[PDB]
């Protein structure tokens, strides 16, 4: 039945129901963090899991989820992002604040990629829903069910892709391949100012530069 187990229409609705630099961005997240409970309850079968696992899932992925959302909403702006507070944060402003690298990553690996393959909101909602149904989050009563729902989002999302964009044989793939880049950008954002900042020493890749040659 596919889409019947993960109504992409229900998800689309969840996604539509909840709509200095570092501090603006921080409050924006603060604001949007009040919605995740709502956006998650609408997602199919989510509220059906053990109350405790719902919390774990939400606790584990809130930052990837929020990042994805503002990256997409930013499809509109140029070299910037649009906060859930109504503020435009420009690329430079982020550089002057000292968070240029991670900021540029979110533009090229997220905003931009999303702008190209013209990612729609149903698709976004499914990636979000895949990020939500993360079975590896520790503490989970039963990873197995969380995994099962995630797979159900797999099927559904693909069916959807082959239907709305049948002339794009690899749509489903281009979407999933966004998740790795999002996961890295995520684990970065969660880093201690020291690991986060601590600018390295312009490495000299001699041993490897060698090996490729030998």
């Amino acid at each position: 039945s596919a889409n019947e187990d993960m109504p992409v229409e229900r998800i689309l609705e969840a996604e539509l129901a909840v709509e200095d630099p570092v501090t603006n961005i921080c409050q924006a997240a603060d604001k949007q963090l009040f919605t995740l409970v709502e956006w998650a309850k609408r997602i199919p079968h989510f509220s059906e899991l053990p109350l405790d696992d719902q919390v774990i899932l939400l606790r584990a992925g809130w930052n990837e989820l929020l990042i994805a959302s503002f990256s997409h909403r930013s499809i509109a702006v140029k070299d910037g992002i649009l906060l859930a507070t109504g503020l435009h944060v420009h690329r430079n402003s982020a550089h002057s604040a000292g968070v240029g690298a991670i900021f540029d990553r979110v533009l090229t690996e997220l905003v931009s990629k999303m702008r190209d393959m013209q990612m729609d909101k149903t698709e976004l909602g499914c990636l979000r829903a895949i990020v939500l149904f993360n079975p590896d989050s520790k503490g989970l009563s039963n990873p197995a069910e969380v995994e099962a729902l995630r797979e159900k989002v797999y099927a559904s999302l693909e069916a959807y892709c082959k239907h709305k964009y049948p002339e794009q044989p690899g749509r489903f793939a281009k979407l999933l391949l966004r998740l790795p880049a999002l996961r890295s950008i995520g684990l970065k954002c969660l880093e201690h100012l020291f690991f986060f900042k601590l600018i390295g020493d312009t490495p000299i890749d001699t041993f490897l530069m060698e090996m490729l040659e030998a």
Binding site: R105, E158, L177, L179, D205, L212
Partner: protein, 242 residues
């Protein structure tokens, strides 16, 4: 689409390369501090021996990885600085991938290069920390569940290596489209090779996501060294520390 002739050859060439790179490396074990069979749970000679053993296999690994990289069409055509970028950051993932392949259910152990099954304790006995070992063995049990095959691990490795978002990559569009080629191939091969199981593909591309996490945990384990007074040998120190 179905497996185009162009594809089937690529895959066959790839599985050809692994066997090759894994052959010219099979010689290097005659240059690897043997695993010490000492009773003292934690001496200082034993701790160093075991740590040398693991760090060395890590070295042979980097080389087996650099050889393979040269065998993937398109790799040797990028900036030398890009080839460095893709390998520098990819190394860890390919290692974890090549570990899961050698994962043994029942034994709950990982047998590196032709023999000697290492388990969680051994891993510990070698310097690694529990917060990295567990995730490792977990990713293992899982990849193992997928009952993948030689070609399937190859394609994955290749997809891992051709990640356009690795830091310091310049020709990002080339790397991207280059990756697409193996994704697409892996898709076809999977559909055919694994019919009645359409999820194999998604399940696969997802491990690519698990690798990013295992990557940052491992880098949490490299720093941990700065407080242990154990040193990484030149090669590893270059691809990680920096």
């Amino acid at each position: 689409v179905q497996l185009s002739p162009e594809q089937l050859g690529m895959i066959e060439k790839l599985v050809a390369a692994q066997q090759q790179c894994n052959r010219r490396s099979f010689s290097d074990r005659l240059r690897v501090t043997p695993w010490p069979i000492a009773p003292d749970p934690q001496s200082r000679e034993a701790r160093q021996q075991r740590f040398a053993h693991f760090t060395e296999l890590a070295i042979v690994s980097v080389q087996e990885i650099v050889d393979f990289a040269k065998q993937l069409p398109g790799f040797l055509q990028l900036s030398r600085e890009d080839q460095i970028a893709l390998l520098k950051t990819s190394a860890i993932e390919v290692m974890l991938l090549e570990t899961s392949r050698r994962y043994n259910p029942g034994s709950e152990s990982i047998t590196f290069l032709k023999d000697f099954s290492y388990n969680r304790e051994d891993f510990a006995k070698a310097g690694l920390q529990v917060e990295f070992i567990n995730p490792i063995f977990e990713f293992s049990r899982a990849m193992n569940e997928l009952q993948l095959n030689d070609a399937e691990f190859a394609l994955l490795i290749a997809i891992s290596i051709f990640s356009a978002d690795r830091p310091n990559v310049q020709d990002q569009l080339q790397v991207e489209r280059l990756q697409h080629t193996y994704v697409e191939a892996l898709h076809a091969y999977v559909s055919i090779n694994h019919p009645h199981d359409p999820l194999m593909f998604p399940r696969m591309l997802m491990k690519l996501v698990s690798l990013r996490t295992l990557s940052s945990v491992h880098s949490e384990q490299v720093f941990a060294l700065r407080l242990q007074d154990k040193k990484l040998p030149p090669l590893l120190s270059e691809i990680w520390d920096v």
